[PDB]
Amino acid sequence: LQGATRICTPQGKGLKRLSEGDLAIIDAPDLSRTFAQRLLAAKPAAVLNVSRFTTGSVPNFGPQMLIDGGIQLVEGFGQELLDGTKDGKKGRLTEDGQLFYGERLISNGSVLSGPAAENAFADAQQSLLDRMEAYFGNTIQFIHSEAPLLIDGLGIPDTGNAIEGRKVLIASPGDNHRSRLKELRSFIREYDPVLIGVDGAADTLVELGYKPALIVGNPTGIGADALRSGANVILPADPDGHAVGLERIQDLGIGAMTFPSSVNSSTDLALLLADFHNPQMIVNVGGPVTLDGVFENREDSDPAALLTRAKLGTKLVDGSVIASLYT
Amino acid sequence: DLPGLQGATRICTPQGKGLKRLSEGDLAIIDAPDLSRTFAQRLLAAKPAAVLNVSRFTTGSVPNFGPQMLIDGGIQLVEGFGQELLDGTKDGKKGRLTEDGQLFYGERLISNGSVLSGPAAENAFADAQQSLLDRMEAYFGNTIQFIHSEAPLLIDGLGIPDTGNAIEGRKVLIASPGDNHRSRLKELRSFIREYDPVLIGVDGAADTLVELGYKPALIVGNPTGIGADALRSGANVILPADPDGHAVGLERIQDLGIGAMTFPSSVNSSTDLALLLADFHNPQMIVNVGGPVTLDGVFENREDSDPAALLTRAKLGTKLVDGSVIASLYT
């Protein structure tokens, strides 16, 4: 198959130039229906993917739509497909999945046939059902054994009257939490929310010049400057009351409270603690948890994370939503 | 003297002046169904002789430990007095509570209550704990079934109509006809003016948007329940349809000669359809006004809750913000 080699992204890179009969170069694992529809409307001879069209986690119909439209599908070329592509140059794709610029080999891919794409979809369909049966089975078990915490707030320490009626901002050490905190500088200055630092993000808050009211996490993994900043330290403890890191708190001579529970995440503990104190709102920075993340996780996801987000209900807002008000 | 516990009758609320002056040995009068641990802790610290509830301490939907904390503290619990307890109470007047749960002001009967013993409160807790497990087994069993049969919608957006490029990258505000949605929309006047979000009116809230002087880009719902002014405003009308494509209210749209699209699905709520439609078009954010759905609502329901509602909120993830959060930025 001979045609122009056009690099396409779901955001609209080469979709406007993609003509009938050319070779589309994409990097789209788990190809979305929207991107497949845009590719299908352009009528390309073949879609060459750097990654796999169906990775196996979710049943995505996109690759089958392309095959039904008479488009050749070749996948798993790898980064060398993007590194060796000249946008617009007439390429040549063989029936074996090889891409050439005349007689020069650029990349080797794996041809995805119609029946193989149907099988991958059916396998992903069964995989999602099995993972969701396990996940929501664990959700029922979690609610049953942790109802004292979810319903009564058993174990949640009383941190005083500082949170009630106020805006709260919780910072967790997720990817790019520091740059999100910097985008929220005007928000923090203008609204003066109660700051809660979780684990290593308590260090980040203190390094940015803040004085968090609360710090949540095992003090073993929190810096000395954050622990000595004046914040009330909330230590996760086993349901029996044993708190790891209490010796460090006692060595420092600082005030601390324990939060006995079976919840492993200190971000979920901080969210449940803030909610229990009846705030006006809770801005969650560096701790995002979504349904799509649960569906795409090939490993077991913790039901306590999605249940905590649902428990906070209408009071929860992600830091990215607030930062978009300042863009 | 006449038998029973004698003490001053004081009306207490989970956030009132009654607690701040509730003294040791008083008969606390409350109206707290499913008594919270926080309110039980504040009542316990005051050391009243008895706590008299208008409602039941444990109604049976959730396992609440509060009543047992009071009983462990040596407080007599009497419940189910009804509104006549609040109507017949005089704050600070010395009342008499018999072992049978009767409240008197001397020899005059005010109200009859049911004595809640420690073992009966433990049994009510254990029963509410089993009823909650049964409901959650039913609820999350339906959630698994929903994900399996509706994966083309949740994963691929199958059935979601293409409304054009107006939503992508923009802030979106969806209005549903929940309680006080009009007064929430009025509190968001500065937000709408300052940020110019894409407006989506759901059902009767499309009428509210048009009455407030707005021109919603989209209207979602059965046109049978939407006003003529909203349907003729210039908005693209999205009709909920059965999985087979049958849309109720299509005859009305065709009589008006206006543009419309259908959204075939097994989701019953037009608010969930509007949220799934907005999310599929990749917005910057989705401000949700008049349609709140929470986990506490699922726990408290007792009737069957729709898993599609909570799954929709989780599907939108980090892009979802309640209108009350945005309105708090203007207070």
Author numbering:
A (entry chain H): 16 to 342
B (entry chain A): 12 to 342
What does the paper say about this structure?
D,L-endopeptidase RipA is the major PG hydrolase required for daughter cell separation in Mycobacterium tuberculosis ( Mtb ), as RipA defects severely hinder cell division and increase antibiotic vulnerability. Despite extensive studies, the mechanisms governing Mtb RipA regulation remain controversial and poorly understood. Here, we report an integrative structural and functional analysis of the SteAB system, a regulatory complex that has been shown to modulate cell separation in the model organism Corynebacterium glutamicum ( Cglu ) and is conserved across Mycobacteriales .
In addition, crystallographic characterization of the cytoplasmic core of SteA revealed a homodimeric organization harboring a conserved functional pocket similar to the phosphonucleotide-binding site of thiamine pyrophosphokinase. These data, coupled with the in vivo phenotypic analysis of a steAB knockout mutant of Cglu , support a model in which the transmembrane SteAB heterotetramer, driven by cytoplasmic ligand binding, orchestrates the productive periplasmic positioning of RipA, leading to PG hydrolysis activation.
